[PDB]
Amino acid sequence: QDVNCTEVPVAIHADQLTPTWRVYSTGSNVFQTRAGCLIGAEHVNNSYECDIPIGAGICASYQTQTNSPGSASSVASQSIIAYTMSLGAENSVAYSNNS
Amino acid sequence: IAIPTNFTISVTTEILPVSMTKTSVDCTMYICGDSTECSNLLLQYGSFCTQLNRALTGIAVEQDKNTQEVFAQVKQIYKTPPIKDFGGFNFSQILPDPSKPSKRSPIEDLLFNKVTLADAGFIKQYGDCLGDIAARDLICAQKFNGLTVLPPLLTDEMIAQYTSALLAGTITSGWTFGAGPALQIPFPMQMAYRFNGIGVTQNVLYENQKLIANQFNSAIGKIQDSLSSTPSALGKLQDVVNQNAQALN
Amino acid sequence: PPLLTDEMIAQYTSALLAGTITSGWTFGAGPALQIPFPMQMAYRFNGIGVTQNVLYENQKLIANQFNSAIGKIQDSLSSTPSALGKLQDVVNQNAQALN
Amino acid sequence: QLIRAAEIRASANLAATKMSECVLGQSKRVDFCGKGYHLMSFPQSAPHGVVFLHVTYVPAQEKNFTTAPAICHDGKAHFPREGVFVSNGTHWFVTQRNFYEPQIITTDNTFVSGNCDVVIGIVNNTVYDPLQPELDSFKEELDKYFKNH
Amino acid sequence: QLIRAAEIRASANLAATKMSECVLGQSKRVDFCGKGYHLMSFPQSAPHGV
Amino acid sequence: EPQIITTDNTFVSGNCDVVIGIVNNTVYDPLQPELDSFKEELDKYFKNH
């Protein structure tokens, strides 16, 4: 939180820590949000209902991405996805002046 | 007796705060800074810091709950029809404005420009306090001491979209919107329904439709005039912001 | 000291009573429109689902009841002690805290 | 902060109640949302708050008139179904309560209840039956048939 | 004092609602103003209340 | 629950020159057909006899 996150990689004093935690210090999945940045979440460009609220309109969920690992992996490898939440089903009432 | 022979349709404004600023405090960093001796000493007082963090987190989550309860009452997002012919009732004064990037109605624009937020709506600090984007003296001085402002879950754009949905539902469907399926109804007949609701016959509207529309439009315009002119109109929201800022200071 | 004196609150209550008695519910929605009080009670009977005539054909009786009821209230206050319990409890709490 | 959050929770609950009862419906609760009879309401977002524009109906330009609670005709007491008996000095009409729309007193806009000895202030006037003139229209035809032929 | 002041504000808000809904009008919501079908309410002043 | 537009489920106010969107149709009065029922009897009496 409140870190860009160009600081995070070694700002935790990663030298004297465990490699397991350092796995979450860097990676291909680094997403910038107004609530800081998110490590370990894939940013999808489509919207769902809010499952886990991160903040500033960004929510996170655990979804069957059905990506290349999805096609390859039998389990259809499920990851954590970060998305912009959708307010609700979109509708338009057929308004007329004599209907 | 005394029976009125005419009417005025009046638009009045009511302002209600819905949420505070989501604030969190690192108890250990406030009390002890970076000293390890003070932290070890503070470990001897028990779970006071955990209690304080729990209470502040409860408040923070409650703020999002408040906003959701107020604004997320609508099941579905509605659009007003492209052709905006509502029998003389204008509404191009409270509906979203496509030209502006924010997609806010003009009244919403005036309202957002009258509450300064006390510069308390900033979270990140690096890059030299975001290159002065976040007010240095207040925000950075506060949060160097473990005092952070968390961002709300719903953005301003999302709250504006919820409001637009509510207006679209009201204009295109009436109250059927909120009791089940949305049922379209021409707006003059909606106003006639509502006239029946207050004890006035339908014909009083259909035989005065132009006058009623003109009065409604003029009142809506006067609302912006008053908000733009009248000082301290949004006093309550500013009071909330000022109280939070003063407590943190 | 409070901003509004007891005399001023009493004046406000007198204004509300006069408005109600002389104009029904009209003075809370716009101009105060005078209406004979029996017609007020007829309207208020219609509001609770009882036809107008029921009032007019029983006016005297209804009046006699209303007046009597008011008297009883005074008695229930003059005789029964601890009737104003809530206000006394507020005063007692404040006094005990200050002590 | 806990106390202030409780206060803001009260405000947010009130705001949600107003959103339900004034934007999503029409409220009969006087002064709950708007001064005057509430027609509708429109919400607007403000920083950390909501602004409701309450559109209400305020009567204006009232004139005095004289009133009675019932009309005695043919020994029967007539009361208005939905309206008031109103007099403009000479003639008696029935008008809806919140807007002056005078109408002739007929059996369609009045109902009978008892004789006119029990109601205080009952006045004398004619109640027009829309069926008698229609019947007479061809009772005249009968008279013409039996007099001119 | 702050907690007690929050409690009285809730009684004053309730009192204001009763003033509006029962003195300035006729209320259909039940048991809000009295027991039975509400006809009309009258306000009176008490040293710190109504 | 569709019903026929009659003079018992409608009320009259003014002439159809001020309401926007008014449409033409017959409003059925229950008394006219019944009265015509024996107006025909009158016509029969005064024409066939």
Nearest CB to F46; choose among D101, D138, D145 = D145
**A35 CA to chain B: closest CA distance, Å?**
6
Chain F residue with minimum CA distance to D145: F46
Contacts of A98 in chain B (CB under 8 A): 186
Q: Cα dist. D80→B156, D95, D96, E35 in Å?
A: 54, 9, 10, 29
State which approach was used to obtain the coordinates. cryo-EM
Q: Bridge partners of A78?
A: A64
Residues 92-111 of B with CB under 8 A from D: 94, 104-105, 107-108, 111
3-state secondary structure B100-147: CCCCCCHHHHHHHHHCCHHHCCCCCCHHHHHHCCCCHHHHHHHHCCCE
Rounded distance between C-alpha atoms, residue B232 and residue B222, angstroms: 17
Closest CA to C87 of C79, C77, C75: C77
Strand, helix or coil for residue D106: strand
Element (H, E) at D2: helix D2-18
Q: How many CB atoms lie within 10 A of CB E45?
A: 16
Element (H, E) at B9: strand B3-17
What DSSP line would sit under D25-60, residue for residue?
S---STTTSSSSEEEEEEEEEETTEEEEEEEEEEEE
Rounded distance between C-alpha atoms, residue F36 and residue F41, angstroms: 8
Residue B34 near residue D60, CB atoms below 8 Å: no
**Given an 8 Å threshold on Cβ–Cβ distance, is B1 in contact with C35?**
yes
Q: How many residues does chain F have?
A: 49
Chain E residue with minimum CA distance to D30: E21
**B91 CA to chain F: closest CA distance, Å?**
20
Contacts of F20 in chain B (CB under 8 A): 87, 188, 206, 209
Nearest CB to B151; choose among A35, A50, A88 = A35
Strand, helix or coil for residue B45: helix
Interchain CB contact of C62 with E (< 8 Å) = no
Rounded distance between C-alpha atoms, residue B130 and residue B141, angstroms: 14
What DSSP line would sit under E15-42, residue for residue?
HHHHIIIIISS---STTSSSSSS-----
The Cα angle at residue D146 between residues D142 and D148, in degrees rounded to 5: 110
Residue A61 near residue A36, CB atoms below 8 Å: no
Q: CB neighbours of D139 closer than 8 A, spacing ≥ 6?
A: none
What strands, in cross-sheet order, belong to the sheet with D92-95?
D66-68, D84-87, D92-95, D103-104
Q: CB neighbours of E5 closer than 8 A, spacing ≥ 6?
A: none
Nearest CB to D69; choose among C31, C33, C42 = C42
Rounded distance between C-alpha atoms, residue D5 and residue A95, angstroms: 42
**Max CA separation in chain C (angstroms):** 60
Closest CA to B1 of C70, D69, D90, D149: D69
Chain A residue with minimum CA distance to B185: A99
**D32 CA to chain F: closest CA distance, Å?**
33
End-to-end CA distance of chain B: 61
Q: Bridge partners of B12?
A: D54
Give the count of alpha carbons within 13 A of B235, CB side only: 6
**D107 CA to chain B: closest CA distance, Å?**
19
B and A interact (at least 3 Cβ pairs within 8 A): yes
**B129 CA to chain C: closest CA distance, Å?**
46
Q: Where are the alpha helices (DSSP H) in chain C?
A: 6-23, 37-47, 52-56, 59-78, 85-98
**Between D131-148 and F31-48, two packed helices, what is the crossing angle to 10 degrees?**
10
Residue B193 near residue B174, CB atoms below 8 Å: yes
Contacts of D101 in chain F (CB under 8 A): 13
Contacts of C73 in chain E (CB under 8 A): none
**Given an 8 Å threshold on Cβ–Cβ distance, is C87 in contact with E46?**
yes
Contacts of B171 in chain A (CB under 8 A): 95
**Dihedral-angle region of residue B56 (phi above 0 means left; psi in -120 to 50 means alpha; beta otherwise):** alpha
**Given an 8 Å threshold on Cβ–Cβ distance, is E28 in contact with D32?**
no
Rounded distance between C-alpha atoms, residue D29 and residue F19, angstroms: 31
Q: In E, what residues contact D, Cβ < 8 A?
A: 2-3, 6, 9-10, 13, 17, 20-21, 24-25, 27-29
Distance of CA B24 to the CA centre of its chain: 22
Q: CB neighbours of D141 closer than 8 A, spacing ≥ 6?
A: F42
Q: Cα dist. A80→A28, B48, C26, C47, D123 in Å?
A: 13, 34, 61, 59, 82
Q: Bridge partners of D58?
A: B8
**Given an 8 Å threshold on Cβ–Cβ distance, is B4 in contact with C36?**
no
**F25 CA to chain D: closest CA distance, Å?**
22
**Given an 8 Å threshold on Cβ–Cβ distance, is D138 in contact with F31?**
no
Give resolution, Å, one decimal: 2.4
Rounded distance between C-alpha atoms, residue B67 and residue D50, angstroms: 10
Contacts of F13 in chain B (CB under 8 A): 201, 203, 207
Rounded distance between C-alpha atoms, residue E39 and residue E23, angstroms: 10
Q: Bridge partners of A84?
A: A58
Closest CA to B137 of B215, B245, B228: B245
Phi first, then psi, for residue A87 (nearest 5°) are -70, -35
**F21 CA to chain D: closest CA distance, Å?**
22
**Given an 8 Å threshold on Cβ–Cβ distance, is A99 in contact with B184?**
yes
F and D interact (at least 3 Cβ pairs within 8 A): yes
Phi first, then psi, for residue F10 (nearest 5°) are -150, 155
Q: Which tokens hold the place of D122? A: 């009952």
**Given an 8 Å threshold on Cβ–Cβ distance, is D31 in contact with E10?**
no
